[PDB]
Each structure stands twice: as C-alpha cells, then as structure tokens.
Amino acid sequence: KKFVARVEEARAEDVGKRVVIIPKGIKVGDVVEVKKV
Amino acid sequence: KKFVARVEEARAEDVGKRVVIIPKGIKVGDVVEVKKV
C-alpha cells in the first residue's frame, strides 16, 4: 500500500483531510514516496 | 532522507504547514514511511 506524491502547502480547504505533516528538509514541490507500514 | 510518522487529521492550526494529503485506504492513526525521491 504505497504511493508517490508531491509535498504541498496546507490551505483552508485541506482542514478535515488526512495528512502527514512534513518536516524541515523536505519542501513543497518535493516528490515523496509514502508506504503504509 | 526518510522518516516514519502517523497519519493525522488536518486542523485549523495545520494551515500553512507542509503536508502530503493521504488518500482513502490509509487512515488517521496508520503509520507510514515517507522517503524523498
């Protein structure tokens, strides 16, 4: 269960969605691979 | 450049943060591995 996506900035319409908060070192625009463990 | 974290619900204080929006299939509470590609 894995996917690829780009980090993005949270906006008012994102409130209520499921997210992983991204830390410093990884910026908006970066591509990340997310895999459920 | 990788980390492990739990999916969480976006709230009003998360507006402005960097996030990956998580799709259906992965829920709040799930542990995921995030790796910059």
Side-chain angles (χ1 to χ4, degrees):
Chain A
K1 202 123 76 158
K2 107 187 125 176
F3 71 98
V4 152
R6 253 179 227 287
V7 175
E8 67 190 275
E9 68 268 33
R11 293 193 311 190
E13 82 270 2
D14 300 322
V15 172
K17 300 190 173 162
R18 314 178 183 173
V19 293
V20 166
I21 300 188
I22 297 288
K24 286 167 196 88
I26 304 178
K27 297 181 169 195
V28 165
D30 283 351
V31 178
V32 288
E33 176 186 359
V34 188
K35 104 189 189 182
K36 189 193 169 285
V37 310
Chain B
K1 202 123 76 158
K2 107 187 125 176
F3 71 98
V4 152
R6 253 179 227 287
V7 175
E8 67 190 275
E9 68 268 33
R11 293 193 311 190
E13 82 270 2
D14 300 322
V15 172
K17 300 190 173 162
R18 314 178 183 173
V19 293
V20 166
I21 300 188
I22 297 288
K24 286 167 196 88
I26 304 178
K27 297 181 169 195
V28 165
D30 283 351
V31 178
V32 288
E33 176 186 359
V34 188
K35 104 189 189 182
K36 189 193 169 285
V37 310

